[PDB]
Design a protein around this ligand. Structure first.
Ligand code: CLA
Ligand code: CLA
Ligand code: CLA
Ligand code: CLA
Ligand code: CLA
Ligand code: CLA
Ligand code: CLA
Ligand code: CLA
Ligand code: CLA
Ligand SMILES: CC1=C(/C=C/C(C)=C/C=C/C(C)=C\C=C\C=C(C)\C=C\C=C(C)\C=C\C2=C(C)CCCC2(C)C)C(C)(C)CCC1
Ligand code: SF4
Lengths: 37, 139, 706, 80, 107, 62, 29, 161, 30
């Protein structure tokens, strides 16, 4: 099953789930970031 | 020869077969011996029943006679089918096998028609053969 | 079998319907005719050109004749601001009584069409005032067409057939065309302006009946030879001057005022005269001057592709400069024909530019001889062809991902009630150029905005006198001379850039892979246009160079569409003096959908309805007409040959087996359209529909509100 | 009719010949070795241009090539 | 009549919490057009405790179907002739699935 | 002279593996034209890994 | 315009009408 | 003031974007109970607008006639935070994704079955490549200077000319 | 007045003539 997790769709989804949820948490605590202050 | 007439299989049907092209120019006939009384699909619709025969079927195109002739060698293993093309309103008798041997098998006595003594990258430019009667692919 | 088509015996032996279609398509493709020698080929081209010229002459004779006979030119000349120019009368028997009362407009007693070609404003400036001067133009062009038609027939006769060497005598042609065709014609056009155009603009009538008596300048032609050229820059027309009368009229014939006449909101006639005289001199001097260049000379497709590219570039130029620098009196005031003129010439330019690359690809498959073309610019571009295409691919992707991304970003952020979160980039490089040209709005204050800068002062010879007239117009908010731009203009300009790069990409990849690719190494052996290479090797649909042009026609329309969509919406606010609508709504796409398409289609879509009909019923019908033929093209583009060929077979069967119909027979066997044919037929429907839909909307939306 | 040319890179695999739906091709004795076989096109007047032959050729870039030409009743595949 | 049928409360992030509109009463969410509110009222459901156990009852039915799919392929797979019994399958779905399903729902 | 198992680079411009590296499967020991059978790691559009070339279309990159 | 100027213009247009037919049947041959 | 743009702290239109936004929500708060759950949902929504606008005044953004923040990309160092500072922030992350997958495919191709290792991701080899991806502006410079960043055009597959 | 005569000639009559002229020209043969 850990060999199955290295296959491209499931390893391509959970990092797409991770890279999304990074930006979801960043925009949650730090809202409305147009520019670098 | 064609052995016309020969018994057409017990079919009775097919709107999709042998219209006015056949009576003006160039229809086709395929003649085989079926060593059973089995049902077989046609190029038009599907059934007839193969006779013991001397079986014969008049078709519209040479395409349909080989497409039926491939079926008799695949499903029923009868490889003695003999396609033809008719007299006065047709053109040339005994289309296949032209040398008596199936074309996938080599036979001595045949001549190489349409051969090119090069590759395709060695073919000249079309600008080199502009305004001439020569063709870019012909040798 | 049959005689038609004459040009191709192999089509002539085809017993099916394909023969007629292909015989129409392969007809003016003279190169592929039977037995056509090089010498015979060129003479046919030349003669075909005379026929085309005559048609052009007859066309503009037909516009003159119909205006003089059924227009309102004489009524228009009296008050250009309020008179609607009439194109021609309407004679459509299918009209009813209420429809005749709706199209009996512009003060006419018959149904007529309001003209939008701008011919009234062009003919006026040249000096025409009455219908009888218009009619005199129509008869003269009839003769010139008959002079063109006779000449084509003449240069086909044995004793007058030009030799092959004459057609390929390149150096002689450049000298004579730049000198004669361009130079002396421009010089002659300067003659018309100082002797007719300028006098008629000052209330003095000059025609053929008196031009040899009256002088264009009080004491002209003694200062010209004695070198005192400065006398022609005497007292110009005052700002009070009313075009077409002697009140405030001057006597200058060659000037350098700059800017636009304050009343007509267009260039000064005297200013246009000096321009052509100068241009004339440039061409006459350049006309006394006269490997890669030999392969230009032996290929008619190479020349045509460059001539299409040269025409395509300057066709766009005509559109850009006519809306911002109006050259015809009262053309800036009629907003609908200014909308029509920009759109018309921009679409033509898109076709020419796409066509330029099309004939370039034809050259590479049929005329490019790779053995006689080594180590030059041509054979070097093919050598790193994959680099060029890959980079063109990158820029398209780069531009596209980000411009669409910002639009989608803005759309979401505006949809959620937070417009302040949008990403709006100011067009600072552009706004710099406007300040370089003199627009003092952004305050960048360098070159022609800086009052002490060398470009405005010019201490070498004290030249800079074009500056007063130019600066007044570019700073007054009453024209289109360097319109104010903002965030909306930034995004669209990159969308247009995206369109120009992607359209060029399709055309460049198609041309550079025309001779061959890995999927089809011997592509050149099959010619410019062929169906494909079968389902083998993975599949080969749309592999011919012709198909690449075909895909690029979709991208150019999209590109020219985004161009024309932008120009129209921006000017719409500008013409209504409420620029705020475009500036704030154009930065997100819902604004282009709600405030541009939906908003301006209110009246157009109501051209006729259950309560009546107005003077927009034609445009409303055409609008629907365009949608139907656009959509009809999708049928040929999505459904392919096989479905149809098998369907047609059941129809052949059905016809032959039905009594009273069996009795009659087709001479040509019915068959489905070809693979290449369908692409062409689908694209032709699509693109006719694309243009006809936008033309109906553009004209009706602007004419409704002005 | 369509023209079907056979180039000298043929390895006598017979795949093209056995792909043709109208029996346009056959194997004939080669004289370059008197051992192997090359494809031939003696009945091109019956070629419909389906290109099934080329799709069966194993060689990296075709030894048999079909260049579509003048169409006829036979070449258009009409039963009418 | 006045209160619009709504579910799917949207999280307070970048601005999609404007989708939680004034839908009726003291609630903010997405007005649904699925007919579930009129279907549960016809079924008789008056409290969310009855909606809760039906969500639990659907999850155990999901696991029962997922266990039956594992069991009837990996562990206990029927033969071909068990599938070709069309007359018994027509008998059972008409009486059991369609008859008792509409009998007990009438109950 | 190219032996079996040697790495070559293809000079045939119409090939899919033109200017690419492949290894020889075998050499036919007769006078048959194009005897050099090269096997490649990349497949072409017909998904085949082998082709026949001549000695003039292969080199001795090694 | 006048009514006689119209029929004058259709009288002139036969000269391109014949010379187009003279050119097009010459371009055909 | 680079294109006629007043700053957003002095823009009178940017203040009126605040006034109608909180008026559209205080009218949306007028119908609810003061202690309810949609009451604190709109009060947290109102205070998100107050942290939106007071962030944009002090950031030094440029507001036009409509009252929206504009970005000035000609890059000046007074306006570097609009495009220049997030531009260098993008390129490192984008080059880290680029140099990882490029070095991953070079490590995979010199193996037995490189084709299956594009389906299955070798977690040792992938974590070896993200170690090589953090140093991409230093690693690509020595890869280019030593000459193994590029191939010559006689080693690449190329169409017939 | 002349509009009422001419627009059914080139609208109906003259296309009926040239379609008749082109159709016999297509289906002639040697
Ligand atoms: C492709 C063009 C494009 C560009 C240049 C941007 C840029 C931005 N968007 Mg936009 N947006 C886009 C497309 C784009 N987006 C699309 C397609 C949508 C619809 C889905 C949106 C919908 C949207 C919303 C609703 C919001 C944004 C916001 C933002 C800002 C990010 C603020 C932040 O905290 O991130 C900083 C991020 C980091 C410091 C970490 C970056 C590293 C990540 C994790 C790597 C991911 C790699 C995979 C930034 C200016 C937000 C904003 O504040 O607007 C003012 C915001 O609320 N965008
Ligand atoms: C029932 C549908 C219908 C029909 C048959 C017509 C017919 C006509 N209308 Mg129209 N019209 C209609 C609906 C219709 N209308 C509707 C619903 C409206 C909105 C209310 C209008 C509004 C309107 C306006 C404003 C005008 C017309 C005019 C005309 C006339 C054009 C005369 C002409 O020069 O044709 C010749 C046709 C052409 C030159 C275009 C055809 C080009 C072909 C198809 C392209 C292919 C060429 C190719 C080589 C094919 C071979 C051809 C060859 C065999 C001859 C013609 C009588 C005009 C008029 O009055 O003229 C006197 C005009 O100004 N109509
Ligand atoms: C290239 C076309 C062209 C032609 C055929 C003419 C022809 C003429 N011009 Mg014109 N003119 C032209 C261009 C032309 N001009 C240009 C480019 C200018 C601006 C420099 C002028 C400015 C001009 C003036 C000021 C005068 C003429 C005059 C004349 C007439 C007398 C010529 C002479 O005596 O020597 C003659 C009809 C004279 C005249 O009286 O016209 C009837 C006269 O006074 N011309
Ligand atoms: C003056 C410039 C010029 C010249 C001399 C030529 C000349 C030629 N072109 Mg080129 N070309 C040009 C510009 C030019 N073209 C432009 C602007 C484009 C982009 C559109 C192209 C794109 C192009 C391609 C792709 C091809 C050519 C080809 C040709 C050759 C044969 C044309 C032919 O017989 O088609 C027959 C003519 C037709 C089929 C015309 C019917 C289609 C029209 C558009 C229908 C119009 C629709 C309808 C009437 C509208 C009615 C309105 C509606 C509301 C009812 C000939 C050498 C062909 C060739 O093979 O060259 C060797 C070829 O494949 N051209
Ligand atoms: C809204 C619809 C839509 C969208 C978003 C796209 C998007 C794209 N097209 Mg496509 N295209 C479309 C409709 C569309 N197309 C249609 C209707 C046609 C006619 C069949 C094409 C024919 C076409 C061609 C021929 C090409 C593109 C290419 C592209 C890509 C350009 C790169 C970029 O802008 O980023 C992009 C993905 C180009 C591409 O993919 O290059 C990398 C390219 O060469 N498109
Ligand atoms: C493709 C997927 C799909 C989805 C997501 C939906 C979604 C929905 N359906 Mg629909 N449905 C679908 C396909 C789908 N339907 C198809 C193909 C049919 C025809 C068989 C139906 C027949 C149907 C009915 C009769 C009803 C719904 C209802 C609903 C809504 C409430 C959900 C619910 O649990 O009701 C649960 C279902 C019911 C309460 C009614 C079930 C009664 C039927 C007659 C039982 C039939 C079962 C039987 C095995 C199927 C016939 C087999 C026969 C041909 C041999 C929801 C919007 C309900 C609705 O409108 O809500 C307001 C509703 O009454 N659907
Ligand atoms: C009388 C008891 C009974 C009941 C309540 C059912 C009910 C069902 N069977 Mg049936 N089935 C039965 C007896 C029964 N079966 C018998 C005796 C046989 C063998 C002759 C079958 C052979 C059978 C097959 C092959 C299939 C069903 C399927 C189904 C389901 C249809 C999908 C749906 O509408 O929900 C449904 C749960 C379908 C299903 O969902 O399989 C899991 C399906 O494919 N049944
Ligand atoms: C098919 C599903 C179904 C089930 C499980 C039940 C179950 C029940 N019914 Mg109901 N009932 C049903 C359908 C059903 N009914 C139908 C179709 C009708 C109409 C004929 C009725 C009309 C009915 C009446 C009038 C009564 C019951 C009653 C009962 C209860 C006691 C009867 C008993 O134990 O024997 C029991 C809970 C009795 C009860 O206790 O009602 C609350 C009772 O008085 N049933
Ligand atoms: C562009 C050229 C053109 C012109 C000038 C017209 C003109 C007319 N059409 Mg239209 N029509 C056209 C193209 C044209 N059509 C096209 C392309 C279509 C297909 C979209 C139509 C579809 C259409 C329909 C369905 C109808 C018309 C009708 C009419 C007539 C309405 C008024 C009327 O009935 O007078 C009253 C006068 C008469 C009824 C008699 C007039 C003369 C008749 C037609 C011929 C008399 C025989 C004559 C001796 C010899 C025949 C002439 C022929 C050989 C050239 C009007 C004459 C209507 C009509 O009445 O049809 C006849 C009608 O119902 N049209
Ligand atoms: C600054 C600035 C600017 C400008 C810009 C510019 C102008 C630029 C240019 C640029 C350019 C003109 C560039 C060029 C380039 C080229 C080349 C040639 C490249 C190459 C590359 C490479 C080779 C890559 C590699 C890689 C890496 C590194 C990593 C990842 C992976 C890869 C592989 C991708 C602006 C104004 C906007 C803004 C402000 C700032
Ligand atoms: S028939 Fe269609 S799918 Fe087949 S090769 Fe031709 S274009 Fe491609």
């Amino acid at each position: 099953f850990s060999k199955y997790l290295s296959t491209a769709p499931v390893i391509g989804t959970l990092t797409a789930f991770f890279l999304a949820g990074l930006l979801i948490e960043i925009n949650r605590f730090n809202p409305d970031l147009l520019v670098y202050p | 020869t064609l052995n016309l007439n020969a018994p057409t299989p017990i079919f009775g049907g097919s709107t999709g077969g042998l219209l006015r092209k056949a009576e003006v120019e160039e229809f086709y006939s395929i003649t085989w011996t079926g060593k059973s009384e089995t049902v077989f699909e046609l190029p038009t619709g599907g059934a007839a029943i193969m006779r013991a025969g001397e079986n014969l079927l008049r078709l519209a195109r040479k395409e349909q006679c080989i497409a039926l002739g491939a079926q008799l060698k695949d499903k029923f293993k009868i490889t003695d089918y003999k396609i033809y093309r008719v007299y006065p309103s047709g053109e040339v008798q005994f289309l296949h096998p032209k040398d008596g041997v199936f074309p996938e098998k080599v036979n001595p006595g045949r001549v190489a028609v349409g051969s090119n003594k090069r590759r395709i990258g060695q073919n000249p430019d079309p600008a080199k053969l502009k305004f001439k009667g020569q063709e870019t692919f012909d040798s | 079998g049959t005689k038609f088509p004459k040009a191709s015996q192999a089509l002539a032996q085809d017993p099916t319907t394909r023969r007629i279609w292909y015989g129409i398509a392969t007809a003016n493709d003279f190169e592929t005719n039977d037995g056509i020698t090089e010498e015979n080929l060129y003479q046919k081209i030349f003669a075909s050109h005379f026929g085309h010229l005559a048609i052009i002459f007859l066309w503009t004779s037909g516009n003159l004749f119909h205006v003089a006979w059924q227009g309102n030119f004489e009524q228009w000349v009296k008050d250009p601001l309020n008179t609607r120019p009439i194109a021609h009368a309407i004679s459509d028997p299918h009209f009813g009584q209420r429809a005749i009362e709706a199209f009996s407009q512009a003060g006419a007693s018959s149904p007529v069409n309001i003209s939008y070609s701008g011919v009234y404003q062009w003919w006026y400036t040249q000096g025409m005032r009455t219908n009888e001067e218009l009619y005199n133009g129509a008869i003269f062009l009839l003769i010139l067409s008959a002079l063109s038609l006779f000449a084509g027939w003449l240069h086909l006769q044995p004793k007058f057939r030009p030799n092959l060497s004459w057609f390929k005598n390149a150096e002689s042609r450049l000298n004579h065309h730049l000198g004669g065709l361009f130079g002396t014609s421009s010089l002659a056009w300067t003659g018309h302006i100082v002797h007719v155009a300028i006098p008629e603009s000052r209330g003095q009538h000059v025609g053929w009946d008196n031009f040899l008596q009256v002088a264009p300048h009080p004491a002209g032609l003694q200062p010209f030879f004695t070198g005192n050229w400065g006398v022609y820059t005497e007292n110009p027309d005052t700002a009070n001057h009313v075009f077409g009368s002697s009140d405030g009229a001057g006597t200058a014939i060659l000037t350098f005022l700059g800017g636009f006449h304050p009343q007509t909101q267009s260039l000064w006639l005297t200013d246009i005269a000096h321009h052509h005289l100068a241009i004339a001199v440039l061409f006459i001097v350049a006309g006394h001057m006269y490997g890669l260049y030999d392969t230009v000379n032996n290929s008619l497709h190479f020349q045509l592709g460059l001539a299409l590219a040269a025409l395509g570039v300057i066709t766009s130029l005509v559109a850009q400069h006519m809306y911002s620098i109006p050259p015809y009196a009262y053309l800036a005031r009629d907003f609908t024909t200014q909308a029509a003129l920009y759109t018309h010439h921009q679409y033509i330019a898109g076709f020419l530019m796409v066509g330029a690359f099309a004939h370039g690809a034809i050259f590479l498959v049929r005329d490019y001889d790779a053995e006689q073309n080594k180590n030059n610019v041509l054979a070097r571009i093919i050598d790193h062809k994959e680099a060029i295409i890959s980079h063109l691919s990158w820029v398209s992707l780069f531009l596209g991902f980000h411009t669409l991304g910002l639009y989608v970003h803005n759309d979401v952020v505006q949809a959620f009630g937070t417009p302040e979160k949008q990403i709006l980039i100011e067009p600072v490089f552009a706004q710099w150029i406007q300040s370089v040209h003199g627009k003092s709005l952004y305050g960048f204050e360098v070159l022609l905005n800086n009052a002490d800068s060398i470009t405005r002062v010019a201490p070498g010879s004290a030249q800079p006198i074009w500056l007063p007239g130019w600066l007044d117009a570019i700073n007054s908010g009453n024209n289109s001379l360097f319109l104010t731009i903002g965030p909306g203009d930034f995004l669209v300009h990159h969308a247009i850039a995206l369109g120009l790069h992607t359209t060029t990409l399709i055309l460049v990849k198609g041309a550079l892979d025309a001779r061959g690719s890995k999927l089809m190494p011997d592509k050149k052996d099959f010619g410019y246009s062929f169906p494909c290479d079968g389902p083998g090797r993975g599949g080969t649909c749309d592999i011919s160079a012709w198909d690449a042009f075909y895909l690029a026609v979709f991208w150019m329309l999209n590109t020219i569409g985004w161009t024309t969509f932008y120009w129209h919406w921006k000017h719409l606010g500008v013409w209504q003096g409420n620029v705020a609508q475009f500036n704030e709504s154009s930065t997100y796409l819902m604004g282009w959908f709600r405030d541009y398409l939906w908003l301006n289609s209110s009246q157009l879509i109501n051209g006729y309805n259950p309560f009546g009909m107005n003077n927009l019923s034609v445009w409303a019908w055409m609008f629907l007409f365009g949608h139907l033929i656009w959509a009809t093209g999708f049928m040929f583009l999505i459904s392919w040959r096989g479905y149809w060929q098998e369907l047609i077979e059941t129809l052949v069967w059905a016809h032959e087996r039905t009594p009273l119909a069996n009795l009659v027979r087709w001479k040509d066997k019915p068959v489905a359209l070809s693979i290449v044919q369908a692409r062409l037929v689908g694209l032709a429907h699509f693109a006719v529909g694309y243009i006809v839909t936008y033309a109906a909307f553009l004209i009706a939306s602007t004419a409704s509100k002005f | 009719a369509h023209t079907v040319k056979i180039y000298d890179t043929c390895i006598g695999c017979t795949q093209c010949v056995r792909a043709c739906p109208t029996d346009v091709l056959e194997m004939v004795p080669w004289d370059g070795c008197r051992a192997n076989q090359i494809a031939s096109a003696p009945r091109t007047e019956d070629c419909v241009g389906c290109k099934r032959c080329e799709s069966a050729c194993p060689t990296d870039f075709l030894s048999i090539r079909v260049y579509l030409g003048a169409e006829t009743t036979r070449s258009m595949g009409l039963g009418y | 009549t006045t209160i619009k049928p709504s579910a799917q409360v949207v999280w307070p992030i970048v601005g999609q919490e404007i989708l939680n509109g004034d839908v009726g009463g003291g609630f903010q969410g997405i007005q649904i057009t699925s007919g579930l509110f009129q279907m549960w009222r016809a079924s008789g459901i008056t409290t969310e405790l009855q909606l809760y156990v039906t969500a639990i009852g659907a999850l155990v039915m999901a696991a029962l179907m997922l266990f039956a799919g594992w069991f009837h392929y990996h562990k206990a797979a029927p033969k071909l002739e068990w599938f070709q019994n069309a007359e018994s399958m027509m008998n059972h779905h008409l009486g059991g699935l369609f008859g008792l399903g509409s009998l007990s729902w009438a109950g | 002279m190219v032996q079996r198992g040697s790495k070559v680079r293809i000079l045939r411009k119409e090939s899919y593996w033109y200017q690419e590296i492949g290894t020889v499967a075998s050499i036919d020991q007769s006078g048959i034209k194009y005897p050099v059978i090269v096997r490649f790691e990349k497949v072409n559009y017909s998904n085949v890994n082998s082709n026949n070339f001549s000695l003039d279309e292969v080199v001795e990159v090694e | 315009l006048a009514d006689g100027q119209i029929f004058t213009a259709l009288a002139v247009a036969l000269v391109p009408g014949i010379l187009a037919l003279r050119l097009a049947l010459e371009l055909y041959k | 003031d680079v294109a006629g743009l007043i700053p957003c702290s002095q823009s009178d239109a940017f203040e009126r974007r605040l006034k109608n936004t909180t008026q559209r929500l205080e009218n949306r708060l007028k119908k609810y109970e003061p202690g309810s759950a949609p009451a604190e949902a709109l009060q947290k929504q109102i205070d998100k607008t107050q942290q939106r606008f007071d962030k944009y005044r002090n950031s030094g953004l440029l507001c036009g006639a409509d009252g929206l923040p504009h970005l000035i990309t000609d890059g000046r160092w007074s306006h570097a935070g609009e495009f220049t500072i997030p531009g260098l922030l993008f390129l490192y992350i984008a080059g880290f994704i680029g140099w990882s997958g490029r070095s991953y495919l070079q490590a995979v191709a010199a193996s037995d079955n490189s084709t299956e290792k594009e389906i299955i991701i070798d977690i040792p080899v992938a974590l070896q490549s993200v170690s090589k991806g953090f140093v991409w502006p230093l690693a690509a410079l020595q890869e280019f200077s030593s000459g193994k960043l590029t191939a010559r055009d006689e080693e690449i597959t190329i169409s017939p000319r | 007045n002349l509009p009422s005569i001419l627009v059914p000639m080139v609208g109906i009559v003259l296309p009926a003539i040239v379609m008749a002229l082109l159709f016999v020209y297509i289906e002639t043969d040697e």
